[PDB]
């Protein structure tokens, strides 16, 4: 460079090939360390700390361990950054879109090292992420007004999402339990009404799910346990000395009896309150505050069970499963809408003690009890079952769903050739290079499986360019079948989700020739 | 209170174990000595790269001289290269075949041990197997016929032994080359060979397939004067040893020269002496006269003028080898150089290479000679070493096959005919001791899965159809199918091995054994 | 064990042996997460399926160097726990909550493997009887474990352990003078008996000496009605709870309190609530118009012990409403057997709940596991290749825990092993390991039994955690 | 202290390699050193007997 | 193999440091037992003479950091509050008889049978 | 970074932040560089800004 | 690896991954290092040097500077 400098001390400057090799080889290593855990029969990874006190997790996907790693690469934090969007968005496709990125990137690679420029690879590219999303908006399968077709599509979609992590064993029941949790919403998109509650001990063919609800709270002292018929109602008030107000007044008396005839007046002003929160002719109390000792006994004395200490989730979740109505003031007594049951007990699960809510009317929301043997076992079950839930739920808002495998790729490799194959210059090369990761894409998982994923691959293309747009892969034998009789669909809002962040993130790292840091702190 | 009382030496710093920990920990690291020394075994293996201590690069394959540079520091590793090389050494062929079985019967043996077995039993039990499978490896055994004319035989063996290295583009002539040097060098009437007589030197430059057999001696050095005529059809060869200076005693002597009439006279013995040792070496009838040390000026001119090549500077092993292959004699002075001590030559001429300023001497077209040169000619440093490496080992291997002038079957069914001898002979011994014999059997089996995978197959499927197929048939011939031919029968294959030196590599590993599960204490620094 | 801090820890059960190693390798800390489950879940036999476990990982080097897919070997296991349970399940014994010698030795076979292998005739018995008076034979699916009380307190042996069937408090009385009364009525006081301090900034404005006085006058007229309402009911034995903001308790109404004959304990805290009210049968009071009415109760004798020289203890025993709560006082001279002998009490009830909620008997010592081991043995032979290997290599990992009894017994291990095998298959399956005879006979003679629960537990997590082992083969450092 | 391993079973090469400082404990040493100079057999049993 | 970032023993160096320790702290306080003994002296490191032979007082002003010390300091301070004359003796006994059964488990005798004669005796 | 086919710049923060921008008046903002003319230019481009 | 040493202090070993990766990394960097100075239209180098007495030399040739740089 020049000899007089610019920069202060400590702070670099790559230039154009330095930069591009550095941001190539950390595509090349994050795609290589996460192509392990990508086909269906894939392994796990222990992500240990070093100063949280030594955090212990197993995971499957590659969102959690790109979070969990935090490198420094700008190249890498750009990817970790996409697939942290996806997450959030739709939580299902992380792996597959930064392996099509690190493919993109490898293929960048030789085709800048073959003196091409970058503009007509962008513009390539662009063309091809079009022609591929032409093609899977055209093929696309829309189903809606049969039922038994779509509640099929629908568990086979959960099974095809289960079969990928640790609940292959068991996706005989884990996928109907999805099944009867995500139809309790009736249609909504209330995803964090959905309670999981993780307990120690025990197999993975005890976590059942109840259908009607259960809390793991205390209730008051000299109440009685069961009760045959109650109506639950939600209260949002302050029974712990409600006096809580910015108003600055005090006691200036000048003798005792006075501060007691005060203390007495607060006492029946109290009961009084509990005598109108009871005016209702209820029997079940819950509140989202503390109850202190002369609430809790009087509503002892009167044969009314009162909970106390509760969040707002399990209020929103009682109010969603009961229909009751969170209501204050306590003076308005035929309008409150309480709610109805036939059945509260307690029952025993473990070694603590949770109160059991059945028989309501609405019944939204449901808890899910899981059993395993350590915590990371646990914690994976957890988060197969809340991606799977949120994928059930994006297919269900999208009411239509594309078979996946690998007739996509195929199919978008097929379109994007056939594209290039018509247009000369020098944009055929970036389209044949979109291909071959298309194509390589599924290569990868044939070869994690164990079986010749060159043959496979071959025999694929040939029947995608023979005519036949249905075939795939089969994972219980290694060789081609028929994807709309075994049952492996997908998503397709998934997928061009997918298909779009590889792209952007295509786009942006390719538009990069320069990197300038300055003076770390 | 109990004071602390100081007993051994610098006790503070030592450390003292037990004795069950240190077994657990010598099969261990034996074990993962055997795993590292794995891949290098069969023709599907690769080689291995060391790094010396100042920036050496050595490529090779031959076991010992991979564990001889490989710097351990846990005893056991440093017995296992010993015994690598004393296998080297006594035999040549297989340096890791013996490591890994006995990592094989100790790994098979730990869980003898961790079942509750006493060690002295189990040793006891691998003795008597090893026994029990050496006296029925000699059942099998097949003669081979030795004679000068049906070299069919060896060269088969010499080809099996170096199919595994990276000459084996060209081991088709080394083989032949290599059996011509024993039998050149055979001393039947001894039963024994040396060494010694036979050349090995290799030179950068060239390729890899002008390896060619020499039945002289080369050397590398050149004339004393490059007007001397380099080429010769008819000459004969004087070895001497004295140098061509003035006679000089080892002891103190002091000339006096009181005169010019004693100058005078020393100046003209000079000449007289010079002069006549000329005449000396000229009525002997050589044409080309062979010293040991340097020359002069007026030595070399008077040589040039009477025409007659010489080479200087062959203070070595150069002068008893051309003196062995022409069969000429050594003179010490120029006055005992007779016409009968003087050795035949038949094509004298040097030869050169590329730009280089390097000239060497060969000497061909001689007589029954009993010392060949082996001339190796590649384009790496490490490719001549490599070369010299197999050629010595397939010099062991007939050496070997002469001296126990008998073959065997090996590849994969040898080891399997005696896991097999030793399971049948184990239902025979319900005195506690079949359990040592059914884990010498097990262990025995290690090389065929090794080999079935640096192939490429099931190791296990392959093995018990091996096992399956010899005990339905009556052939101790079927190994494991490493090239993919179709037939596992190595006996149309051209698969042979050799029998005393399984023999011996089975007699070191079972004694290695019962030695290492010996000891069981260790006090180190 | 000796922690950082330096606390010795002497205990015998394989869990908390594992819990205070504090190992750093994820497969290690995944075996203490693993044994923390079992010791939740059943309670017995956490070192069993430890040892199971490192059995199975142990030959599975074998299967993994042979080249066996992990998938394959996965399958193999869960085949083999199925037909595992289906075995034990199909070998149960019935057995019913009325034989009491059954319960007795099942209670006393978990109380001969530490230190109190010569106190278990005392230990069992009182076990047996307190679990008996908690739970009920009607109908009841499991046993509270948080209902029953465990009191450690330091002096004499462990011999000198009864069994109170009432409230046992540690703390003394704040009364000096009445120590023992015989006809006490207990009654629970929630409220504090102080100065009248409202919950708003309250303050008392004085400009004259009338006034001074006045106020003085007011509270102990205010002191002297209260103490004439608490003993207008009839009480005799005062509970008042832990009061962190106002004072609980004053001089002048003590000094009443104690004119007046009555007890005062001020040391309850707000978590043993519930506990009392079960137990003594009472109800909380925090209004002074309600401690007249029905909120009150009767007891029995309610006086208090000494011990040697340690301090003081409260005993009440005798109730109007017994309830289904008890207490164990422990006794001994060093801490750590006082906590030993906890952990087997705790160990003996768990077993005893787990028999009551599974209500199934099996033979012990390593019967069972030869057993399971000649079953599987026997069955890999109509399996195909890969298959009958997995289930060969499943089988051979059982005989460890056969001759590791053997082996800390004395006697040969190999030979045990051996012996057990060529009995279990020639007509008897009840075929154990004597430790008082020195060979092999039937082990139903010795009186030694063990729950059929508690061994299918252990088998099935530590399949479980065998198969979660060979899904995990990388190692990634995080931040 | 320089890394060569000495195996003998006997127990007078033990003792020798052990380089003992205590002045008490070299009583084993030499009577050991006496009975392998006087017929060379018996090292060991002597000092278990001492 | 097994990280347990310590240190650890065997099986009998720790029975014989256990017996080495108790005959140690047996043999401190083992001239002021009989009518014939005479008194001790503890200093600190301000310089406060304390003469005293008891034996609790001693072992509780002794502060050994050995398990088994602790062990016996505890009985002594149990014994001696308990009682209060006897608080040698007792110790004495208890390190006679684990050296004694030092030399039954060392004869390849299990602990629990030396456990059960010794609690019939 | 000037014409229709010029590419990006990528940025790094102090505390570790990415930012890849083409404007050159942030592109020169973000460089805390210590020459007296590379600051004159800056402050140039950041009043054109 | 295994958690017994083997080797001495200050010995590292790459098993079948790393090892090739390394060699094949070396060896791109070293037909790459040469690759500017091939086709008949190349340029010349700079190999200079300061352990020796500050020798400058400007050749085309690729044996002399892959000689002159001293790989490792
Ligand atoms: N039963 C199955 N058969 C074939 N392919 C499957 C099956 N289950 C999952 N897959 C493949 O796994 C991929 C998704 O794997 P996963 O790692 O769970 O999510 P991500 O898309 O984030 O990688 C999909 O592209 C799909 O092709
Ligand atoms: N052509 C062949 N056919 C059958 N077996 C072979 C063949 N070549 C080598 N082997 C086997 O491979 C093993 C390894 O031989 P090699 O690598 O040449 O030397 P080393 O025995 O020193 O490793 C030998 O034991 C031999 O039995
Ligand atoms: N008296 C006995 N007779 C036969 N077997 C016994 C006896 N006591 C214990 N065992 C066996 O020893 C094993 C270990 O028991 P123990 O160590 O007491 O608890 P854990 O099972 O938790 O390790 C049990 O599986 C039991 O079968
Ligand atoms: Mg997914
Ligand atoms: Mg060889
Ligand atoms: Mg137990
Ligand atoms: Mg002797
Ligand atoms: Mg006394």
Redesign the interface.
């Known amino acids: 460079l020049a000899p007089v400098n610019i920069f202060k001390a400590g702070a670099d400057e790559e230039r154009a090939e330095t930069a591009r090799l550095t941001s190539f080889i950390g595509a090349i290593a994050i795609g290589d360390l996460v192509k392990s855990t990508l086909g269906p029969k894939g392994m796990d990874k222990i992500l240990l700390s070093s100063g949280r006190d030594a955090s212990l997790m197993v995971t499957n996907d590659g969102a959690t361990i790109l979070k969990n790693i935090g490198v420094d690469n700008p190249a890498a934090k750009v990817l970790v950054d996409m697939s942290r969007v996806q997450d959030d968005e739709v939580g299902d496709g992380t792996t597959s879109v930064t392996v099509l990125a690190a493919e993109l990137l490898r293929e960048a690679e030789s085709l800048i090292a073959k003196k091409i420029h970058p503009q007509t690879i962008i513009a390539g590219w662009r063309e091809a992420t079009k022609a591929a999303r032409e093609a899977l908006l055209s093929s696309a399968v829309d189903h809606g007004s049969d039922e038994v077709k779509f509640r099929q599509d629908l568990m086979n979609i959960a099974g095809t999402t289960l079969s990928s992590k640790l609940l292959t064993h068991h996706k005989d029941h884990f996928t109907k339990l999805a099944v009867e949790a995500v139809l309790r919403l009736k249609g909504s998109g209330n995803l964090e009404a959905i309670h999981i509650i993780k307990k120690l001990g025990g197999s993975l063919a005890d976590s059942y799910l109840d259908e009607g609800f259960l809390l793991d709270k205390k209730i008051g002292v000299n109440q009685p346990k069961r009760i045959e018929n109650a109506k639950i109602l939600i209260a949002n008030t302050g029974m712990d000395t409600d006096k809580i107000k910015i108003f600055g007044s005090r006691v200036r008396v000048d003798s005792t009896a006075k501060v007691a005839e005060i203390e007495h007046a607060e006492k029946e002003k109290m009961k009084e309150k509990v005598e109108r929160i009871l005016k209702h002719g209820i029997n079940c109390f819950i509140n989202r505050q503390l109850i202190y000792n002369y609430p809790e006994q009087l509503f002892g004395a009167a044969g009314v069970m009162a909970i106390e200490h509760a969040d707002f989730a399990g209020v929103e979740r009682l109010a969603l499963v009961t229909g009751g109505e969170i209501a204050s003031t306590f003076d308005h007594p035929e309008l409150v809408k309480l709610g109805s049951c036939k059945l509260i007990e307690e029952v025993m699960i473990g070694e603590d003690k949770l109160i059991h809510f059945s028989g309501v009317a609405l019944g939204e929301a449901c808890t899910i009890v899981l059993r395993g043997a350590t915590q990371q076992i646990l914690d994976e079950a957890e988060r197969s079952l809340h991606d799977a839930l949120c994928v059930l739920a994006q297919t269900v808002k999208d009411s239509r769903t594309v078979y996946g495998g690998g007739c996509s790729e195929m199919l978008m490799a097929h379109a994007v050739t056939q594209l290039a194959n018509r247009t000369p210059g020098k944009e055929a090369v970036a389209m044949e290079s979109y291909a071959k990761a298309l194509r390589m894409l599924p290569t990868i998982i044939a070869d994690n499986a164990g079986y010749d994923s060159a043959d496979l691959v071959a025999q694929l293309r040939a029947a995608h360019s023979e005519g036949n747009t249905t075939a795939g892969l089969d994972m219980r034998e290694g060789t081609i079948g028929d994807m709309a009789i075994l049952g492996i669909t997908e998503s397709f809002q998934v997928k061009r989700q997918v298909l779009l962040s590889a792209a952007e993130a295509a786009e942006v790292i390719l538009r990069v020739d320069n990197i300038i840091k300055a003076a770390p702190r | 209170?109990?004071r602390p009382?100081?007993?051994?030496?610098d006790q503070d710093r030592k450390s003292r174990l037990?004795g069950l920990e240190a077994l657990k920990?010598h099969i261990?690291?034996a074990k993962?000595?055997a795993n590292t020394m794995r891949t290098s075994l069969g023709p599907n293996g690769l080689d291995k790269?060391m790094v010396d201590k100042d920036?050496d690069v050595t490529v090779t394959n031959d076991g010992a001289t991979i564990l001889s540079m490989?710097?351990?520091?846990?005893?056991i590793?440093?017995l296992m290269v010993e015994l690598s090389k004393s296998q080297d050494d006594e035999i040549g062929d297989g340096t890791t075949g013996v490591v890994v079985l006995a990592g094989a019967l100790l790994e098979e043996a730990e869980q003898l041990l961790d079942?509750?077995?006493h060690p002295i039993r189990i040793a006891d039990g691998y003795e008597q197997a090893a026994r029990v499978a050496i006296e029925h490896l000699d059942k099998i055994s097949d003669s081979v016929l030795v004679d000068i004319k049906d070299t069919e035989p060896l060269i088969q063996t010499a080809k099996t032994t170096l199919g595994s290295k990276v000459v084996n583009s060209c081991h088709r002539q080394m083989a032949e080359i290599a059996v011509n040097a024993v039998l050149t060098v055979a001393d039947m009437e001894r039963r024994d060979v040396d060494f010694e007589l036979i050349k090995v030197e290799g030179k950068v430059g060239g390729r890899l397939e002008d390896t060619k057999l020499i039945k002289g001696v080369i050397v590398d050095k050149d004339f004393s004067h490059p007007q001397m005529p380099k080429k010769v059809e008819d000459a004969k060869i004087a070895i001497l040893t004295c140098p061509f200076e003035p006679p000089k005693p080892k002891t103190k002597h002091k000339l006096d020269v009181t005169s010019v009439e004693d100058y005078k006279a020393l100046q003209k013995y000079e000449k007289e002496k010079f002069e006549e040792m000329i005449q000396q070496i000229k009525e002997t009838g050589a044409n080309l006269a062979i010293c040991q040390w340097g020359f002069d000026d007026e030595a070399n001119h008077l040589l040039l003028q009477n025409n007659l090549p010489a080479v200087r500077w062959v203070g070595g092993p150069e002068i008893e080898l051309i003196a062995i292959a022409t069969g000429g004699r050594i003179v010490p002075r120029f006055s005992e150089l007779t016409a009968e001590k003087l050795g035949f030559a038949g094509l004298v001429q040097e030869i050169s290479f590329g730009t280089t300023k390097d000239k060497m001497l060969v000497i061909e077209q001689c007589k029954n000679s009993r010392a060949v040169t082996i001339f190796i000619r590649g384009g790496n440093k490490m490719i001549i070493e490599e070369a010299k490496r197999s050629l010595h080992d397939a010099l062991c291997v007939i050496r070997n096959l002469i001296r126990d002038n008998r073959v065997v079957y090996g590849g994969g069914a040898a080891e399997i005919s005696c896991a097999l001898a030793v399971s049948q002979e184990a239902d025979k011994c319900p005195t506690?001791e079949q359990?040592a014999m059914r884990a010498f059997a097990d262990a025995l089996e290690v090389i065929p899965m090794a080999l079935s995978?640096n192939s490429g197959m099931?190791?296990?499927?392959t093995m018990?159809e091996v096992r399956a197929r010899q005990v339905k048939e009556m052939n101790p011939a079927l190994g494991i199918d490493c090239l993919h031919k179709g037939t596992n029968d190595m006996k149309q294959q051209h698969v042979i091995e050799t029998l005393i030196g399984k023999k011996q590599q089975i007699s070191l590993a079972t004694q290695m054994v019962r030695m290492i599960l010996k000891?069981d204490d260790i006090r180190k620094? | 064990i000796q922690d950082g801090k330096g606390d010795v820890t002497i205990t015998n059960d394989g869990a908390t042996i594992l819990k205070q190693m504090q190992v750093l390798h994820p497969a290690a800390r995944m075996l203490v997460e693993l044994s923390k489950a079992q010791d939740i879940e059943a309670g017995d036999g956490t070192t069993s399926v430890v040892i199971i476990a490192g059995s199975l990982l142990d030959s599975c080097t074998k299967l993994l160097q042979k080249g066996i897919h992990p998938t394959i070997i996965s399958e193999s296991f869960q085949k083999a726990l199925e037909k595992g349970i289906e075995i034990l399940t199909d070998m149960s014994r019935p057995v019913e909550l009325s034989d009491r010698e059954t319960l007795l030795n099942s209670a006393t076979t978990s109380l001969n493997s530490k230190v109190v292998s010569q106190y278990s005739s005392l230990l069992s018995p009182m076990s047996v009887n307190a679990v008996m008076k908690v739970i009920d034979p009607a109908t009841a699916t499991s046993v509270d474990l948080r209902d029953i009380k465990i009191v450690k307190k330091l002096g004499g042996t462990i011999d000198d352990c009864e069994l109170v069937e009432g409230l046992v408090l540690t703390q003394k009385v704040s009364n000096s003078g009445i120590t023992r009364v015989e006809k006490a009525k207990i009654g629970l006081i929630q409220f504090c008996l102080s100065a009248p301090k409202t919950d708003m900034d309250n303050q008392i404005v004085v400009s004259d000496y009338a006034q001074m006085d006045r106020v003085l006058r007011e509270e102990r007229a205010y002191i002297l009605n209260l103490v004439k309402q608490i003993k207008k009911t009839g009480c005799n034995v005062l509970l008042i709870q832990k009061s962190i903001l106002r004072d609980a308790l004053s001089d002048l109404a003590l000094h009443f309190l104690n004119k007046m004959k009555i007890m005062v304990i001020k040391d309850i805290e707000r978590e043993d609530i519930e506990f009392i009210c079960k137990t003594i049968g009472t109800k909380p009071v925090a209004h002074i118009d309600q401690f007249t009415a029905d909120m009150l109760g009767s007891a029995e004798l309610a006086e208090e012990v000494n011990l040697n020289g340690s301090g003081k203890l409260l005993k009440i025993t005798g109730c109007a409403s017994p309830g289904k709560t008890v207490t164990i006082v422990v006794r001994g001279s060093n801490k750590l057997v006082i906590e030993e002998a906890e952990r087997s009490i705790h160990d003996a009830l768990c077993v005893i709940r787990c028999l009551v909620k599974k209500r199934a008997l099996i033979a012990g010592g390593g019967a069972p596991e030869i057993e399971l081991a000649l079953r599987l043995t026997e069955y890999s032979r109509t399996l195909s290749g890969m298959e009958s290997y997995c289930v060969r290599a499943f089988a051979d990992a059982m005989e460890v825990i056969p001759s590791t009894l053997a082996e800390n017994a004395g006697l040969n291990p190999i030979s045990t092993v051996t012996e057990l095998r060529n009995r279990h298959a020639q007509g008897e399956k009840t075929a154990g390991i004597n430790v008082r005879k020195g060979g092999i006979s039937n082990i139903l003679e010795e009186l030694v039994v063990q729950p059929l629960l508690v061994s299918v537990s252990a088998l099935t997590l530590a399949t479980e955690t065998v198969r979660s082992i060979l899904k995990i083969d990388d190692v990634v450092n995080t931040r | 202290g320089r890394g060569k391993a000495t195996i003998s079973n006997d127990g007078a090469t033990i003792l020798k390699l052990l380089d003992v400082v205590h002045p008490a404990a070299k009583t084993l040493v030499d009577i050991a050193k006496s009975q392998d100079a006087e017929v060379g057999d018996g090292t060991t049993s002597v000092t278990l007997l001492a | 193999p097994l990280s347990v970032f310590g240190d650890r023993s065997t099986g009998e160096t720790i029975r014989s440091q256990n017996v080495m320790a108790a005959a140690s702290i047996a043999n401190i306080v083992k001239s002021s037992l009989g009518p014939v003994g005479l008194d001790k002296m503890l200093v600190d490191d301000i310089g406060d003479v304390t003469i005293t032979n008891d034996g609790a007082t001693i072992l509780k002003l002794l502060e050994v950091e050995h398990p088994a010390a602790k062990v016996l300091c505890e009985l002594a301070d149990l014994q001696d509050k308990e009682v209060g004359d006897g608080t040698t003796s007792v110790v004495i006994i208890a390190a006679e008889l684990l050296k004694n059964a030092d030399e039954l488990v060392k004869q390849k005798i299990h602990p629990t049978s030396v456990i059960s004669g010794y609690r019939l005796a």
């Open positions: 209170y109990g009382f100081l007993i051994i030496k037990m920990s261990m690291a993962a000595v790269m920036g490989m710097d351990v520091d846990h005893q590793a440093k079942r509750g077995i506690l359990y995978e099931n190791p296990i499927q018990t000891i620094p």
